Design a binder for this molecule. Sequence first.
Ligand SMILES: O[C@@H]1[C@@H](O)[C@@H](O)OC[C@H]1O
Lengths: 676, 682, 677
Amino acid sequence: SEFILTSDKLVWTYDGHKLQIEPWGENSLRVRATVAPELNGNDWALLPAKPSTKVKVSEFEDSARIVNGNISAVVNGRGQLSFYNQNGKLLLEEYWRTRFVAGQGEDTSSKYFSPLTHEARELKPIQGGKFELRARFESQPDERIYGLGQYQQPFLNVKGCTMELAQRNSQASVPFMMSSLGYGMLWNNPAIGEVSFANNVTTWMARVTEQLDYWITAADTPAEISQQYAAATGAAPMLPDYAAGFWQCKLRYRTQDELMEVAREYKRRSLPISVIVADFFHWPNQGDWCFDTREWPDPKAMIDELKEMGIELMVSIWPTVDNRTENYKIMKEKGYLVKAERGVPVTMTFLGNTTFFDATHPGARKYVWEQAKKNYHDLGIKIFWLDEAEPEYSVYDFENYRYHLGPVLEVGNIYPRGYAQAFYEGMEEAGQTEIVNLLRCAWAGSQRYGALVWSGDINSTFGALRNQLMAGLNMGIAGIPWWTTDIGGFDGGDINDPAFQELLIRWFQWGVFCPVTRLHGFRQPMEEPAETYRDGIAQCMTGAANEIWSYGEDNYAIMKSCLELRERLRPYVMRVMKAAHDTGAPVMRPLFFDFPDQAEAWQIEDQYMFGPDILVAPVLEAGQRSRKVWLPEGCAWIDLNTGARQNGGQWCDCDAPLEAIPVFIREAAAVQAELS
Amino acid sequence: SEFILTSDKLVWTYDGHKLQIEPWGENSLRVRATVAPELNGNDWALLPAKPSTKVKVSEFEDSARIVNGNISAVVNGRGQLSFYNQNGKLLLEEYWRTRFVAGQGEDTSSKYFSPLTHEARELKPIQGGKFELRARFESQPDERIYGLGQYQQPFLNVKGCTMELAQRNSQASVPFMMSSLGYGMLWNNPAIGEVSFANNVTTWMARVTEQLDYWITAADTPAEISQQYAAATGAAPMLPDYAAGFWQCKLRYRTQDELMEVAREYKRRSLPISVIVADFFHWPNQGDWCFDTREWPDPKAMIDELKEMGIELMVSIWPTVDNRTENYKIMKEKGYLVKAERGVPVTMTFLGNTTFFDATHPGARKYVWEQAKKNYHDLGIKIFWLDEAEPEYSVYDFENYRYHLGPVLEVGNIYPRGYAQAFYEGMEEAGQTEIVNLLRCAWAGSQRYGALVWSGDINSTFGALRNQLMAGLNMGIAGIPWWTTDIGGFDGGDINDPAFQELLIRWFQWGVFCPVTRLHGFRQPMEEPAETYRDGIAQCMTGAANEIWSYGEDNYAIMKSCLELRERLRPYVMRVMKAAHDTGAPVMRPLFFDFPDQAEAWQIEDQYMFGPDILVAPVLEAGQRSRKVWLPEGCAWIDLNTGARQNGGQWCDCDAPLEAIPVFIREAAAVQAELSIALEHH
Amino acid sequence: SEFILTSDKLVWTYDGHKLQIEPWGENSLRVRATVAPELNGNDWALLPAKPSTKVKVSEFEDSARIVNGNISAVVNGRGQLSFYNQNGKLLLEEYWRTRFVAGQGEDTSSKYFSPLTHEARELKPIQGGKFELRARFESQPDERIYGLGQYQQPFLNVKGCTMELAQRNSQASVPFMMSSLGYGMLWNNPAIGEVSFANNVTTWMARVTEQLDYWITAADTPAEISQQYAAATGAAPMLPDYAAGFWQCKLRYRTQDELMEVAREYKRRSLPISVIVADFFHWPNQGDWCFDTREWPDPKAMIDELKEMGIELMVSIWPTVDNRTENYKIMKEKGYLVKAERGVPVTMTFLGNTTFFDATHPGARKYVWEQAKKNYHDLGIKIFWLDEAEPEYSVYDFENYRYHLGPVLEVGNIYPRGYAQAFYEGMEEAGQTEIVNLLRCAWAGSQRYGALVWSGDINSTFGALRNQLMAGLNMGIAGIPWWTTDIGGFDGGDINDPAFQELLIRWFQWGVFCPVTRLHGFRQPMEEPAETYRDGIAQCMTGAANEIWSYGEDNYAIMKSCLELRERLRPYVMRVMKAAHDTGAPVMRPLFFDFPDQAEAWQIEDQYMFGPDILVAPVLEAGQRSRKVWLPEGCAWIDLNTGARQNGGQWCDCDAPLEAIPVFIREAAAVQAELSI
Ligand SMILES: O[C@@H]1[C@@H](O)[C@@H](O)OC[C@H]1O
């Protein structure tokens, strides 16, 4: 057992195991461990640290200690690590269960003494290869845990839950967590694996990796934790103005004329509309990244008319490359495609045999961007819908695929970050500022590449709506402030079904108080293409209409008023977006973000704060016409729908007619005057 | 160390390793070993053995011995095994290199003493799984080794060569070997692996297996070894008479009219023709197994007219099932398809995303047969072209596929046998006798299912032709008497190119003296289909013409006379085919099969015997117009082309003009009279 | 398909596959290939290249070419590679069997066209990991192949043979090959694997690796190839004088008194003796690396007396560290030990549970050297016996062990080079020149660390003797000029058995004309130790006596004249050793090394050249009293035993009584003058 101590770095070593702890921004430490000869150069999501002035490394008895502001790490003579805040309170301690460790007998008076033989930092060698990593920490009975990204589950507090560290359609692993004990932690490792916050032990796992790497931060409030995390992995940029308006989309406007007729109908009725969207398979083949002129005769003319109307066009980008295309040939020559380890060299079979471009290859990123630049960006398109961002393998056999940066088991989760980066860096180099692209997935730090994330191809049910509320809140905690959904859900909504129409209204009303308000879906009754194939290429179907006038007049009036409300909200949304850029605060936040001293704020999972001044209580059940709403203590609250004043620190039974959900405004906040 | 002996079985055991040796037919032993609790019930290619009456099991000193006729196995107290014949000559010896084995020190006076620590029977456990098997035997300085199946290499004798135990297009692993030391050995294990007959050590390897299993046989002559092997794995059936005639094929007759135009034109020129062939993609989609009526409007009328003409139709069967078909849906419901272990559930991407039917699944065999029965056999088609029989994965990642009988790594090589079995059993059940189907691949015992094997999609060169001669002869030694090639090779022959025309003629001349005489290929210039797609299904191209009149008048005359010569040979062919059925002897044989006592017979690799009465000496180089020919001792030889008589036991410098290759007939054999060999005085 | 060409580098790429060919010494090229983003920085055995005189890179048609003196590489538009010499003759061509390659249909007129789908450079991805590599080349009909290291097999020409690329007791993978077609090739990759020189195809295989890496060289003669190889991987140093004399050893002299009594007896009988050896388990425990004072009370006094007698002491070093020792604790603290991937953390169980020191770890190398320096070298010991150099795992499950530089499957074969390096660098740093240590194993480049390799614990038979001849010759071709055996073999020789005694004499006679003349073995009847354990530590047995007088008076007379003959040869041996250092030529050479233009020189495997002036024809069978000997053309030959002159270019029946083997001297060679004076 040997310490190697300098003024700003703690290293411990035994039997080739190196544990290295150092400052990494104010109130924060980076922890690394390896049994290779040295640590490698992989920083993954962590940006260069602003130097800490206050770091102090000490030695006492058989231990060593490193303090950086409000966090300290203690490593004992057996190489066992625990973390404390500035008040000396335990934040986090490693989980050891051994009789012998670091060449020494374990202390029989400690819960660490056990014949079971579990190490806190298990680097298990893979034969012929690298390491299978498990990092174990003690559970705590009072610990509540948030963040981790976007999971399709009805839990805000994820203590007791196990989350797969993998990317699938409707899931995003963004592995930053925030604990109610007063710390946050980033698992700075893109390997396929799992995080289990089980009641008996916390275990982080990486299937294949070179080394342990995490970042831990301490502060007295969630807001400071979020700020410290944003300094570690990058700030969201400033949201462009147009992104705060209404985004109109469906699966799918099949022709230029169809899309333009919708936009013209919005303008004919003087309705708000900021963005309109051309969904997938508007292209001749996958990997062409251009409009098919048979259905889109004059894209420039579409964009120019939309510009006259004050509307931005967003276009679908698929990362797939069909093997019959010219771009497949050239990308294959250059080595810019993902590779199958075994079997046919095909990663997806949706409407063609396609291979994904490799978003971890800097050359492939540039290539795909420059195709999109030439065919779309040069025409005046400045928003891209970066769909299939996981990427969506037809079969999620992660072991069977390899990227430029290594096997998908080792590096796979960073794909969506690279995909967003390709477009953000490309658009920035082309002279665009305030970039936003619609990404289906993300990793740690995706926020710095302007990633507006949505929750994918979920079903159209109230159960799904409930999951989306939890997922969006946890995404904000994981540092992804720009987040949204398909209003009404993606799959299964019949436009003539009264039950779906009720869900649509409830989801729309919530969508007004989401970071982006976006109508999209694949509505029934669907329509098969007239021709199944054209030039041997399978043709893509469409769903039914999905405009605010498509569901009758009663529903039209409700959604029209929703759009008018969203327009009145825009200055407040831009203020909250600037705050997200400035301070790393989410836009939609759990109650504890703004009221961390109040017990109820850490319990309630069906209410949230839309910025600091608006309390939102969505209706999450069919047929519900009232619900209980807890009003936080410390201010009075103004009912958005009645103008009535209510004192903080009480439960209210609130009216929730089909035409409105309960929403309260912080008294005397600037947004109060803006909304009436 | 412990022997468990009975009157007809030797078992040795130490530390869970069981070695079991027992008689398995006359002059033959089966050898099995495992570290599992017991031996499993897998017999693979071995048929039940006829009881051997005089089997003798003894123990002496610390050793044990089992004798069965001309072969004996000796196992010493360290479990080390060697084989001897009735004259006490060493046939085959296990390779051990250890200082400590079976709980005992190794003998320092033996070549077995070595710190290296190699076992002869290495069952290396796969973590969480079964075993990786290596069976090591000592090499022997003057051992020459034949058989093993069909490999694309210019070596008849494969001592010093390493052969992959896997099935790929143009390769067939049929793992029966015959040694010049006077034994034969079947590796009775369908696992993916390798056999290396290296000069320093012989190693058989199986990637995944439950147990070691081989069959070994001893006799004084090759013919006896071949007979004993056919008794162990099954006799070839009797060939139907039409199969000895001329088979006309190309890639591809696209329509009923095109095929019938060729058939009628053969009859109009009074040319011999016994089989005509409809190649692949005559169907609406892969897995439909029926004629596409747009190109083939009345299959019944086609078959009836061909029958009036004395011609059998053969049709292409592909084992692929495209995922848009009705049979895919049903076969998926029932579990009748091969499965990918990882990635997209697609085993081949040629003209569609297809999955192979599982030829190791009894239910799937029956399902595919009954489709072919309903759509082809009930109409009067008696011959099936079982193509892609390996099967031809787009990528040969054997580790990524699984069959009914287990992972491809453990059982993969038996697929072509099951594919043959599916059609043979079905046609037999339907009342057909004398069955022959054209298979691209085979395993040990494929011969019993009427498998006429051909050597696949080789290129059209003299290099290829040389490889095919070696491959065809080794297939015969491996117990596959019915074997042929694409005359001219498959890929790359332009019909207007003199260099290819030269090759076509030499290959055709050789083809006359192959077990089946079959013209096929994908000739240039190729023609793309008019429509690349139809109903979203990719359409299949065709090559150029490939009939005997398609290469100019001078070449037409040579091929015409080749066909006429083949017809005169038919009675002899049918006698030699009967001998293959009765004795297990190959049809095309190396010289050592008929003349085992003569040294030149074990050295010469560019001559062979076509039955016992015809010596063939093919021309295997462009521009060559004469070659040396060794005539075997013990008889006189009649030159087929001149009529001259030559004494056995000499090298002759033979004329070999474009119009004929050197062929010699055994004097006074019945075939001499049948060939009508004159000698005019001008 | 894309070429990236500069003045001295050819790169070809398709689908992330990068093939890079460049000069690496005169008449030589280095070939690397990877599917990773870039080539790594691993040079393994290749030393920095001297920049070449006339390197030319050019593109023509759809191909590219790189010429460096007498070798050239051609890469076509399908990425397929072949090598030619200055006369345009094909040396080596890649084996491809595909219908489609590098995005293009294959040529149907070529032997490369095949549906089998075998690539010449197969970098097969291991799931979650690196690559399984197969490099395939066409076999050639008259190609004869030599080198590869030390294998226990009766084949000099290894065409048709398959060799394991792994290190085991009695085997050494030193993967430089020399072909009769006029090239040599180093497989510059330490991975566990295999080389298959099959008649139908040549296949090199690595179980786990990051990239393809080989070095290829061309010259008109074997001598130039050997020289070019030595420039690439390092010259053998100059051998010290004492190493050419007689090395006396057995398993084992158990005490200081017992060793010294043998040394004194050799001097008392006026017999030559240059080195005497303390074998294993002279230490308190494995990993102590010091004399046990209970059996060795005054080591400094022993060394001083041997110095007075003109004798160097060599001591056994074992790379094992027993888990009860002080050094185990410290080396485990520092991470200087080899690791088991699974199961009990024990690599060997011989007389204790031990773990090997990690010879690929620079710190571990330094640690072990400094233990040996403090306890042996500082006392005046100048030669170490680096035994168990593979290292000798109790079970050779290479997948189950890991070194500093990675899994044993990826890097394992370089261990013995590291082991030699540890002592050579330390001894050189300590002020010693002309270093020689006795290594049981080697890899490519081991020669530069003064590695005298011996063929390990082989059995005592005539079969073994035949194998050793072949192995030693092939080790020389592989660039290991300092090579020897246990005279008599290691295991199974009973000193009272007349059959063994005959083998011993024939082996000794051959031993006179080996690069080093060294007597060693574990002779029967063996003797168990007095007590099985002392202080819980299992005690090591000894074999019977193994001195030249231990086998009766008639045998003593023969071995006595062998030693005297060896002393007369020492000036010649030292000249041949200097030539090895200057030119990379081996000491014991096959006939084709000195007579490459003669057909018989490439066929004969039971004769060899001991330097350029002595033709040796050992007796390799029991009871043989005469044998056939081919005399090379171009000079006359003097029979060493009779003095009779013989013209070159003929076969002779030579008398081979028990008292001599047929040896011939090149007429008028300086060694003829030295032997007759
Ligand atoms: O939202 C959908 C997206 O997730 C994918 O399936 O492509 C079509 C879109 O409508």
